[PDB]
Amino acid sequence: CLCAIAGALPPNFDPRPVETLNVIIPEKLDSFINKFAEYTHEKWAFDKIQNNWSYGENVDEELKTHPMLRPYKTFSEKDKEIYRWPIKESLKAMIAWEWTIEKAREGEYDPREGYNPQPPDLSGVTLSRELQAMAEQLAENYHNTWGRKKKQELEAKGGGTHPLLVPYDTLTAKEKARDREKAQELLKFLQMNGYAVTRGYFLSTPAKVLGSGGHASNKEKEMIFCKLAALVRHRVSLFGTDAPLHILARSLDARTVMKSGPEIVKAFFESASEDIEKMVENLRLGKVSTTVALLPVLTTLFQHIAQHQFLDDVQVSCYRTLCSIYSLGTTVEKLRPALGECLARLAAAAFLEPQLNEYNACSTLPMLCSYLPRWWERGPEPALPAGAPPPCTAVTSDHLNGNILRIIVNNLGIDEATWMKRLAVSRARPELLHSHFIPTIGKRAGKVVAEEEQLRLEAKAEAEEGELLVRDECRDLYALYPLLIRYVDNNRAHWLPNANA
């Protein structure tokens, strides 16, 4: 669910300060420290100028005076160290992370009584998001450092807790700002100096590729406890698939990879159903738009050869990849000829869902001729062979993408054959799937004879209601007839031409 949330975004404390005091800054950077300390005391005097503060004998807030308000040149270097200390500890903390801080780009309201700094405007500098992460993590350093000192201190005092004694990610954004702003000046002053400063979303997708690597670890499992977690991770891949550009195509290739490693098991079971949802993720892989994916078809051909022998789950996954072929209808060719080979494997002879998969696979005049022969077979109306022919019917619907309209009227005559078949079960439900193909196939005079089949529905309703009159003094046999007749009513939904009426 958290993955769904981040995917929606894509559209006794234990402080860890880095070691600081042990680290050694190069001495030439200390001259830079002179600069940041200079601006530090100058701007600090400047905010005091904002409130009309001035130098005086002693520390007296009510007197509008403060002794430290004296020029930076007046400081002894050791007094400068009092402001250098956060600077040196910060830069040493960065060198412990070995963040680069090096020479590069060229270096650079009534006035009040007393010392008068005229500061460069550091606060206006624009940190880059990588550098914003750097300031975020240095502020995280102030957080963990002054916070670790605060925890060891309060625990030394026998005290309880403080609001800031928290992991840095916890913070409300303005609390992040409380040290982020001090770091900003730390890094904003760096960028204003123009010095190179480095650690030395799409991240969800790259992490998905990392999931593909952990999936290679799952291939290591295919070599055969973590693997169940890999299965829940596959479920996460499904829910992430529900959330679903070239890197995304790379992810599609990863989907082909996981589909293949799953395909090794193709020839507990709920994880195989997760492999089916993973096949839907393969449909998402079809959505993305190297040739290794075509190899998946090559296993499909030999699996098709297994069909000649007459397990089934591999054929179902092939039906799902065929649904991805329907996505191609919403959208290597020799591998399509291999799909024609599997079509021959179905042509040799329950597997009707795989037949529909072939109808999806349809998405060259010889195909039209064999389809005409299939119409000749349609003339014959053992019905299970027609159920196999339903794939040829939907493939014929694919062929329309003319004469195929009148051929579709002949298909309506085949539906009349289905009506004669319907005069008195689950194969009839497969015929209802064929009726969905008729919905794809959607002349009135054929629907007039079909209306005569509706008259057969009237005779059937009459005999059935009369059977209910027998019930007044069993009906379930008439119920299934009412259901197939309801499928014929779905064919009437295909007939919905009302404007012509």
Swiss-Prot record:
Reported tissue expression: Detected in skeletal muscle (at protein level). Fast- or slow-twitch skeletal muscle.
Top-level division of the source organism's lineage: Eukaryota
Record note on modification: The N-terminus is blocked.
Annotated localization: Sarcoplasmic reticulum membrane
Sequence repeats: 12-108, 109-200
UniProt note: domains: The calcium release channel activity resides in the C-terminal region while the remaining part of the protein constitutes the 'foot' structure spanning the junctional gap between the sarcoplasmic reticulum (SR) and the T-tubule. Pore opening is mediated via the cytoplasmic calcium-binding domains that mediate a small rotation of the channel-forming transmembrane regions that then leads to channel opening.
Subunit structure: Homotetramer. Can also form heterotetramers with RYR2. Identified in a complex composed of RYR1, PDE4D, PKA, FKBP1A and protein phosphatase 1 (PP1). Repeated very high-level exercise decreases interaction with PDE4D and protein phosphatase 1 (PP1). Interacts with CALM; CALM with bound calcium inhibits the RYR1 channel activity. Interacts with S100A1. Interacts with FKBP1A; this stabilizes the closed conformation of the channel. Interacts with CACNA1S; interaction with CACNA1S is important for activation of the RYR1 channel. Interacts with CACNB1.
Annotated function: Cytosolic calcium-activated calcium channel that mediates the release of Ca(2+) from the sarcoplasmic reticulum into the cytosol and thereby plays a key role in triggering muscle contraction following depolarization of T-tubules. Repeated very high-level exercise increases the open probability of the channel and leads to Ca(2+) leaking into the cytoplasm. Can also mediate the release of Ca(2+) from intracellular stores in neurons, and may thereby promote prolonged Ca(2+) signaling in the brain. Required for normal embryonic development of muscle fibers and skeletal muscle.
Family indicated by similarity: Belongs to the ryanodine receptor (TC 1.A.3.1) family. RYR1 subfamily.
Comment field (misc): Binding of [3H]ryanodine indicates that the heterozygous channel is activated by Ca(2+) concentrations 4-fold lower than normal. Single-cell analysis of cotransfected cells shows a significantly increased resting cytoplasmic Ca(2+) level and a significantly reduced luminal Ca(2+) level.
Descriptive protein name: Ryanodine receptor 1
Lineage: Eukaryota, Metazoa, Chordata, Craniata, Vertebrata
Gene that specifies this protein: RYR1
Shown chain mapped onto the complete sequence: 2702 to 3431 of 5037
